[PDB]
Amino acid sequence: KSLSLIAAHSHITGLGLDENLQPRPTSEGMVGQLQARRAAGVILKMVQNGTIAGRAVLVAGPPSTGKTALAMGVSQSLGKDVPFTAIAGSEIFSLELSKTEALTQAFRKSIGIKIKEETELIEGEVVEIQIDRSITGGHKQGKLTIKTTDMETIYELGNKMIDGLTKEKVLAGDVISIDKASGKITKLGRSFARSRFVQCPEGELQKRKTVVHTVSLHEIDVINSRTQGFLALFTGDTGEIRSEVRDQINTKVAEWKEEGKAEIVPGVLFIDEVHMLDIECFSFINRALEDEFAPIVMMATNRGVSKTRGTNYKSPHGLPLDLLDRSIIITTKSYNEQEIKTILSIRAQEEEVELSSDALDLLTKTGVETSLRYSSNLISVAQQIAMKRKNNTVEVEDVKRAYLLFLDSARSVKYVQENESQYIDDQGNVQISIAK
Amino acid sequence: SLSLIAAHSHITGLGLDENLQPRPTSEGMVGQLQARRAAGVILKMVQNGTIAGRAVLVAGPPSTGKTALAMGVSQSLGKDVPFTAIAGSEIFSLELSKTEALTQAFRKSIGIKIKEETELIEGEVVEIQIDRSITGGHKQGKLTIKTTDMETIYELGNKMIDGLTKEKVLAGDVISIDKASGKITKLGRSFARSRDYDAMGADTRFVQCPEGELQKRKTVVHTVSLHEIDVINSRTQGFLALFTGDTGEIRSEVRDQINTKVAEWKEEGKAEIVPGVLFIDEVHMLDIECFSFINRALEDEFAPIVMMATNRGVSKTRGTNYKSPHGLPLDLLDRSIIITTKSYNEQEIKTILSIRAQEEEVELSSDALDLLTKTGVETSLRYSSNLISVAQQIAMKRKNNTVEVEDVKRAYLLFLDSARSVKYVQENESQYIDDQGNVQISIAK
Amino acid sequence: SLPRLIYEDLILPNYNNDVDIANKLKNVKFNIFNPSTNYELCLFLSKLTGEPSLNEFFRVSTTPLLKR
Amino acid sequence: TIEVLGSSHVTNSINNELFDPLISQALSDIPAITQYNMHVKKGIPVEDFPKTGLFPEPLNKNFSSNI
Amino acid sequence: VTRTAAHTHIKGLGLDESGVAKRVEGGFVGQIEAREACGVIVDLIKAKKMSGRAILLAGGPSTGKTALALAISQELGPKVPFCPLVGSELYSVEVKKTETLMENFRRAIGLRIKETKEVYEGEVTELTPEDAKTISHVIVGLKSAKGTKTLRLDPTIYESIQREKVSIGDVIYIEANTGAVKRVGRSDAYATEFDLETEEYVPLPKGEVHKKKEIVQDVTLHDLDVANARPQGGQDVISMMGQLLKPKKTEITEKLRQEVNKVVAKYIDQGVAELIPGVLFIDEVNMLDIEIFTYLNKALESNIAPVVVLASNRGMTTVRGTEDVISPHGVPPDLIDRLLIVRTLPYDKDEIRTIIERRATVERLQVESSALDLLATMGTETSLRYALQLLAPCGILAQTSNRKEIVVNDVNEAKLLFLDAKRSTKILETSANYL
Amino acid sequence: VTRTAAHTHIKGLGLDESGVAKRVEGGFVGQIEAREACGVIVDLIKAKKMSGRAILLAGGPSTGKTALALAISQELGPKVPFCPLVGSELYSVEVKKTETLMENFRRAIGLRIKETKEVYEGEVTELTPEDAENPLGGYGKTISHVIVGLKSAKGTKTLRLDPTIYESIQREKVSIGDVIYIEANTGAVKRVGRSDAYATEFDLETEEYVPLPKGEVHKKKEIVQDVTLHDLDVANARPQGGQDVISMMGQLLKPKKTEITEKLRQEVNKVVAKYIDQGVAELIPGVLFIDEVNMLDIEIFTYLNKALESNIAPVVVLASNRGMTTVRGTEDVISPHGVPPDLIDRLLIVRTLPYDKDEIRTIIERRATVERLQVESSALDLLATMGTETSLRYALQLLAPCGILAQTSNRKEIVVNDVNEAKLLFLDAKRSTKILETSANYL
Ligand SMILES: Nc1ncnc2c1ncn2[C@@H]1O[C@H](COP(=O)(O)OP(=O)(O)O)[C@@H](O)[C@H]1O
Ligand SMILES: Nc1ncnc2c1ncn2[C@@H]1O[C@H](COP(=O)(O)OP(=O)(O)O)[C@@H](O)[C@H]1O
Ligand SMILES: Nc1ncnc2c1ncn2[C@@H]1O[C@H](COP(=O)(O)OP(=O)(O)O)[C@@H](O)[C@H]1O
Ligand SMILES: Nc1ncnc2c1ncn2[C@@H]1O[C@H](COP(=O)(O)OP(=O)(O)O)[C@@H](O)[C@H]1O
């Protein structure tokens, strides 16, 4: 499941921490930033305890210094069944939803409800189906022989089971699963009879299976609101859900919690590029954190003393001081040459690229010279130059060829500045002719 | 009832004589004699109804009584005459243009009066007998209806028979049929059959059996505005748009047809035209486009008398880049007449506070009233008006039925006015967020 | 996949929830087109629209659009 | 498809919503011999028939299907 | 177990019977005058006589305004409606902001309805309709574990019965007042008629067939306005799939509100209903446009308007939507003339220490007294909220090293791991490339 | 004979097997390093392993930036999807720009599926329904079953149809003597036409006559389909294709773009991953091309920063011709090519160079060859000198008026007098600007 080619954070499998919340130097694909990893482990234990709500954590640092990778490590270490909503800053500027409504829907997608229920199923391999019908079809008599590897039985069939069996046509040798109460019959395939292919079930025919459901609060809000059905969870046109239905859902969840029929799980809402939000969104977030049904919010930004959007003054991190008073700030740092070399080694092993040692030294030098992401991007295009001349290992001259072909930012800025007459400036003045 | 003590609920009409001379204190209005005389002149202009499309402007400083004057005009106008009261911010809609919203507000303030006759036969159905011919082309009906006093037998047409198949009757439901109009309705089930079917159902309801005369005669009078006729003739089922506001830019040709048919009905004698007053409170937030539309729309024959209230000085007109008196352009002020209002003195403030304390069922001593009068002289009037009602609760918590000077002093110390808050902000402005977003949170430097 | 608890405690009426009581209270008892409580409005609308039955507005206001 | 495991009321509600007889009869028509059987051999009048034939016609014969 | 989120140590104003605030009561530390003023406002709301009264409480950030509003809401109780609001929620893309303001105004006026619930349930043993093509009535005989009961029914409920496909032997559910019919399933006595079947099987109800209950319905005027003004039309009781046409919000006219008021006023006079006015609380009131500020003046002069409570933490600030209007707290002076202003004062050292101890007690944490003075010094040096938010990382770091008591080394470690706004700003100024 | 418009003289990048670009082949002249870099990018796309890679083509106006993207699209082939965009197309009035960008991201990931269809087909010979007991019972349809007799070549079958199938059967207006086609996967029915076994010339409805279908009535066939992920997203968002009430009403309402939630995309990804694991599907990632990238503002750039870091997103190729320009939606930031530096850090810039006189001359020669015109050598030299003096595009667009003026003089070649007359009749930008400077009333 979960198809994926290769991501930019695909080498991260979680936070590398021991039992005493101390970071290993290199574990689970994360290198360096020991204080940030320890703080994120503390935040992970805050989420896993689940006894407090509505805390804001800000991750700030220079660009391309492990900011989104920390959130990916936290999300991988969180595990399944716990919600994790990752949105961007500019995603809430909708055309059919207000900004506060989009923020409310993002907030209420990170709180789950755990419900455990048990059902009865009949799963086995069909041996023989005998159906007797009349001329007009008024009455039908049926016999079905079904089996597992441990038992054999024959069932006398009713009318509705006969109609549910001629629909979704089953034959001998099929493996099917029958729910008695709902009448849903699912064909799991054929058994191991050559005469898709599924091994025959074992044990008892009638098993009692318990499944654990995890339903977000937003789904119950959409379902309980009678204006739209459950299809609005897929089409997306919920359209400004009112507040009384949310109050009813909150009271009913609090009522279910006392009787033990349900459990509250909290999640993490991750807002990447939080500086793109407007001032009214910040004012809504200032009051959305003071509720019992609120998740733990992680925000990331790289702005330093920038202009707040929707205002005319400059604020630290692009955020007003009311939001900064409610938050605790984790600061990330820049990397040395050894961290860059280790990260490039991990990215080389992820992309199945064999690198020579001198090519790794050249990539580390051009990584500490210009950027980490440029040297990370150079590997996958140097491998194609390596394969073009029919060679497996990436050599020094392949990295030099990739450096010659694809430019970085600092060289392109200089090449623009020396030849400014050939490009369109801010005044729309360009020169296209070569002569004169 | 569903009305609490509002801001100005003590005003029941303008306190005028039969010669349009205002009394010094009558009908809940104190002072402001020239504005009351001008409002009486405008009220007589409305009651005459032969002058169409006049704009007056009630201008004054804040907390003077412009909206109080409009409320007095509305109360003295009486019932069955349309008085529309809207604010300037209500016409900036998302599904309607400002021109269309202003046109709907204009047409909501002029109505027509229609009188009709009713011959109601209200009673409980005892038994219904249907006679069908052998051909089946006509159905005959014998209806046995009753009240608590007497019962008659009625013969029925086939249209009655088909109208009683729909919303069907089950020999004991209370119906009422007209004779000339033939309107059919089903009120509900009688109370005598309430212990029969052991479970009510979905649509059913229990009503008492009507008593007295079976056949009644009643004359009713309806007042329909032109906007309701526009909404009704705009669609197929238009009353849902009348109650949900989903009209959506009704065209002009239906308005011309409705105007022509209203003139035709007036000429025939079926209906008569009742004009009204449209009140636009806080007119200074209207755009320049709305002002130009008002200038053109004031010159039509089907136009009401427009009352506008504003309290701005020489301020900027919205949608432009210059300033103007009252926040209104000069061509709009040309086709208008201005009623100005003057500030009060100590005695009128004392009388207003006494009337407001009488309305709110609060008993004050003379010294407490003089202290509140001094506070209303120094500060504004609404501050003292709120101080009365909070001092009443303080006195009730002190287990006393009267408000004394100590309760007024405690309410003065607990709740601040504008000037003390301004002084406290200007003394400690480092703790408040200023216009640049700078604030000092910690107490230790 | 929806849990059974949500369906039995939020949609269908039982002895411990007030779906049907609130439905009848909001859609029938407090409807402004009820001729038992708002006969004057029904008469005014019947004069305005020309409908021959005073129960038509209560019927129209409580049906879905496609069925109408 | 929405499923609730171990409940027959949700199946009846879903089958009633997806395959409403009134709307599906409105989007189709009765066969002619069936109409003759109910109008003549059963005494049902024409005005008591269910509403039929409200599906809008396509532009061509080719525009009626995607195959 | 229990979730604590920035509040819920506040249980009330902590006043006595005479309205004098004790120093430490109800989870409140200090703030005598604002608590006494809020108690006077609570008494005024419980008087239930006045309409459209507005107060505003202003002060610095992190000083107790929202705590005071929630304490008022706790003091009034749950039967009185209380609608919290932020000033940025009024800007919706479906309707105008004045319509949203009037909706939130009418959401704060409640009603109380006395109702009776009557329920029949049990196995069907007899289903005999009687005519005079039209059924006159139908007789249904139910059965439970305590006996049987025979009921007559009108054909309207019979149509709902044949809607539900009810046969002999099914367990049904009939509400007497509303006519609701629900089919639960087939009885367990008929579980062996076939070996494999589609029907679900439920046991007999152990209680009686006939059950009666008294319930109290709480509604608001906005719910009646919504229920009377559905644009597409009514809806069924069960609709798992939504309508084909999407119904959006519409500008509800004044005529519908007048008719709703007339119907409710008729129902009140018979003793059926009871009118409970409530509180509309708007936090961050400086995020409102000048048009909403102007419409608030009209809305506060109505006859049915509730008590409005506003909060703001601005000083002399320009009003949003204007250019050169400077007024205190970001509120225009024509509105400022209509409220009463309650001042809220900041804190000194010992109340900060006591609040920190209270939040440590609520969060079930044990702090040494040596670390408490350092936490109070940290709170006075940087922020109260920074000291309050640092308790849980301190507890987690103490629990990691198998300790159940906060040691000052954990406070130093949590100070090193997590920064405040001032140290982050000092990092921002002394840096080269975008932090 | 054929239509030419500013392109279609370009058939590919024109490289050998070692990736070395020739000087003139494949319709390209010059730009050796850019063509070699684009060949490396083409090999990276054909590897089908990476996700979310991006390059930027930077250069002056009229230097061959869009030409290189079209050459990449021609070198990839028609099976690999390619979605060309302009920067102004992301601003829509029905849905936000973020959803439009995600839609164009999902529109560039292809999929090839071997699909199996259960097919009943034949000629209708008997169409007999039977009735219900109480048609006016309110619940249940009017009829209960429909008996359909189908005849194909060397076979004949009879079916008892469900009423729900019969609604789609009678919506197609079939009759006795028509060849039909029933698809059991969806219940869709196609009416092929009248059978040719009966008479032909007695019809008035211009129908099509078809022989009997070969083989048996009941069949199973395998069909290879090409489907993008965006097609599955919009199919599940607006469901049309069933036989239910909702699927029937979905075809009649006016379609509108909606914000498709990420839950539907996760479900579609899970189903596609299951199809790939079953061995019946193959994933073909593609290229998304955004020309004139400077028209985007800061919000779309900030969302693109997140969207490039997903594990599905295809290779994105951008283009710009600005030197140092403020980003749209901002006030005072200044960044190269109108692209903010946080997005610039994730790119790989490919520089493009201006041409010379000889390259201009041979480009003019090849474009005159493509447009089927004969040009004299002196006229070609004058056209090359004009292209150096004014613009390459101005010398390019003056070829066809020269051909028209040559054809009006009853000639085939193009001579110097036609070039001079096209100079005098038609102006360029510099001479028009010089006229506007020395003008009377804003000419
Ligand atoms: N500690 C780390 N371990 C592994 N990879 C890292 C680490 N720090 C940064 N990276 C890599 O550097 C790249 C940039 O990181 P990211 O935080 O996403 O950028 P930004 O700081 O702009 O958000 C990512 O692709 C990530 O894989
Ligand atoms: N002449 C008057 N008689 C009685 N009450 C008055 C009079 N003038 C003003 N008031 C009272 O003053 C209060 C505020 O006056 P208002 O009409 O709101 O001033 P403005 O017209 O400037 O808005 C109202 O509650 C009203 O009852
Ligand atoms: N007197 C007090 N006693 C206990 N806790 C208080 C007191 N005053 C404020 N607090 C706490 O301090 C915090 C201040 O938050 P809040 O009042 O929302 O800030 P603002 O006043 O800026 O809106 C709240 O979490 C509240 O619990
Ligand atoms: N190397 C080349 N060989 C042939 N024609 C070229 C070459 N480079 C550019 N052209 C032509 O120049 C014109 C402009 O190129 P194009 O990339 O479309 O615009 P721009 O360079 O302004 O982005 C195109 O019509 C193309 O045919």
Side-chain angles (χ1 to χ4, degrees), chain A residues 282-300:
Chain A
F282 297 137
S283 288
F284 179 71
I285 284 174
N286 285 351
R287 270 287 280 151
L289 295 188
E290 329 204 9
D291 209 318
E292 197 266 347
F293 298 105
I296 288 193
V297 188
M298 300 193 23
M299 321 175 278

Side-chain angles (χ1 to χ4, degrees), chain A residues 7 25 38 110 181 190 207 239 298 333 385 432:
Chain A
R38 180 147 216 240
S110 317
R190 276 208 152 276
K207 275 170 202 349
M298 300 193 23
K333 317 237 175 322
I385 313 174
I432 318 157

Side-chain angles (χ1 to χ4, degrees), chain B residues 4-5 389-390 415, chain E residues 37-38 40-56 72 76 80-84 104-109 276-282 296 299-300 302-310 340:
Chain B
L4 309 117
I5 303 176
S389 180
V390 294
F415 296 92
Chain E
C38 288
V40 174
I41 292 305
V42 152
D43 295 349
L44 190 128
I45 292 153
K46 280 202 217 149
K48 291 195 268 181
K49 274 173 46 64
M50 305 282 321
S51 163
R53 322 288 320 278
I55 79 164
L56 156 79
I72 286 177
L76 280 176
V80 182
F82 180 81
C83 187
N104 287 313
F105 252 68
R106 273 178 90 87
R107 249 193 209 101
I109 300 297
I276 319 157
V279 184
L280 170 77
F281 170 59
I282 301 178
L296 203 41
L300 276 174
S302 196
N303 324 309
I304 206 61
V307 180
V308 194
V309 168
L310 313 181
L340 300 172

Side-chain angles (χ1 to χ4, degrees), chain A residues 15 35-47 52-61 67 70-71 74 84 107 267-275 285 289 295-301 317 319 322-332, chain E residues 386 389-390 392-393 396 414 417-420 424:
Chain A
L15 261 43
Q35 309 222 317
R37 269 154 87 201
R38 180 147 216 240
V42 168
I43 297 310
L44 180 73
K45 283 289 299 297
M46 281 194 57
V47 176
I52 48 175
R55 292 270 207 276
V57 170
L58 181 74
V59 197
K67 284 197 291 297
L70 244 196
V74 164
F84 193 87
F107 259 73
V268 182
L269 164 70
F270 174 58
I271 307 176
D272 215 345
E273 311 276 318
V274 84
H275 52 86
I285 284 174
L289 295 188
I296 288 193
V297 188
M298 300 193 23
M299 321 175 278
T301 167
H317 311 265
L319 310 183
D322 310 359
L323 191 52
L324 285 182
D325 214 353
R326 297 162 149 86
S327 320
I328 39 184
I329 295 155
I330 305 175
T331 315
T332 71
Chain E
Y386 177 63
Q389 274 146 9
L390 226 58
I396 286 190
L417 287 167
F418 305 99
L419 308 185
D420 54 84
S424 187

